Design a protein around this ligand. Structure first.
Ligand SMILES: [Ca+2]
Ligand SMILES: [Ca+2]
Ligand SMILES: [Ca+2]
Ligand SMILES: [Ca+2]
Lengths: 199, 199
């Protein structure tokens, strides 16, 4: 009844990262950078706005648990002040929107804690998880879960497409967004899952 | 433990409407028209984009139930084609955002069915329910519930404010939004409730 829709690098496991608490600052393979407000530069370093992948394993200062799936998470850090806009990850899938089908999108959202180069990582920017067809946000969880520093929680987004939906046959998409509505203005995501079932 | 925050005309019961399936086309008392894309004109008639209040009682063609609360619902109709933007209701409250507090916003969302002047009311535009502080959308339910023609479902939006939240002491607000992502491009709301409890 319930079928999984394939997602590339759905757990941010590519690339492999060896050293505890290490990270990349380039867009994770299989994803693109969602950048509607031009907050993230094309060339990134540690302290520019950025996104990438990070290893969360034993030894980590960031959570009271390990990565929800595998070794790694995906993260977005925004250096601009709260209110400046949003940015995140986007992936357009090969699957298309089909009628009489209920879609369930799940992703784990992480509010890491700790301290980085004497800067407190306490606080959280807020998140939004979106399911798309074409350019249209069909359904989204805008920041409904309370996630304390050092923990992950699972966001669930659902959508049912009827035969009259204007966006049938358009490509499905997923966005994972840093809302930049608080500091420390970084957050993590892991274990993106998309399933389908009859409406 | 759980305290209710007062909302004006929270069930759209003002004005009273006598005749089955009758409606107004002016902004409900206590609310304003949320109009970020200028879709709703200042002066409305039956077939312009509009909003107002409507009686849902025995005799109605619109639902297989009566109004969720009282006699009336509040509605938003958008005549522009899907994708043209959004509009709805907004109300700014006297309550302000307070730390260590969990807010729960509930509203019933209705997908009316039937036929109006030979135009089918089947289909739905999509909804978004927002909790605000100041100008900031703290949390929102963007269209997560599947609501068939002729029924209502309750949307629940939650948000927990921490002592570090940038928007503490700003006025709370509520938006009820027609997403204009399908036709027939009208929808109803009723029974707005906002409660608070310790985080
Ligand atoms: Ca992973
Ligand atoms: Ca944090
Ligand atoms: Ca009512
Ligand atoms: Ca309808």
């Amino acid at each position: 009844s319930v079928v999984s829709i394939p997602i590339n690098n759905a757990g941010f496991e590519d690339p492999f990262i060896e050293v505890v608490d290490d990270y990349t600052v380039d867009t994770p393979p299989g994803w693109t950078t969602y950048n509607p407000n031009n907050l993230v530069p094309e060339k990134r370093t540690t302290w520019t706005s950025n996104n990438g992948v990070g290893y969360v394993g034993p030894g980590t200062q960031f959570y009271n648990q390990l990565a929800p799936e595998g070794r790694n998470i995906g993260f977005i850090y925004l250096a601009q002040k709260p209110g400046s806009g949003v940015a995140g990850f986007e992936q357009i899938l090969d699957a298309t929107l089909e009628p009489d089908t209920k879609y369930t999108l799940k992703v784990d959202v992480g509010n890491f804690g700790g301290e980085f180069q004497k800067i407190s990582l306490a606080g959280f920017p807020g998140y939004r998880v979106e399911l798309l067809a074409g350019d249209t946000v069909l359904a989204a969880d805008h920041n409904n879960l309370y996630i304390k520093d050092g923990e992950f929680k699972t966001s669930t987004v659902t959508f049912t497409a009827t035969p009259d939906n204007p966006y049938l046959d358009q490509k499905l998409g997923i966005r994972l967004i840093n809302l930049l509505q608080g500091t420390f203005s970084g957050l993590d995501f892991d274990n993106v899952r998309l399933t389908v079932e009859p409406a």
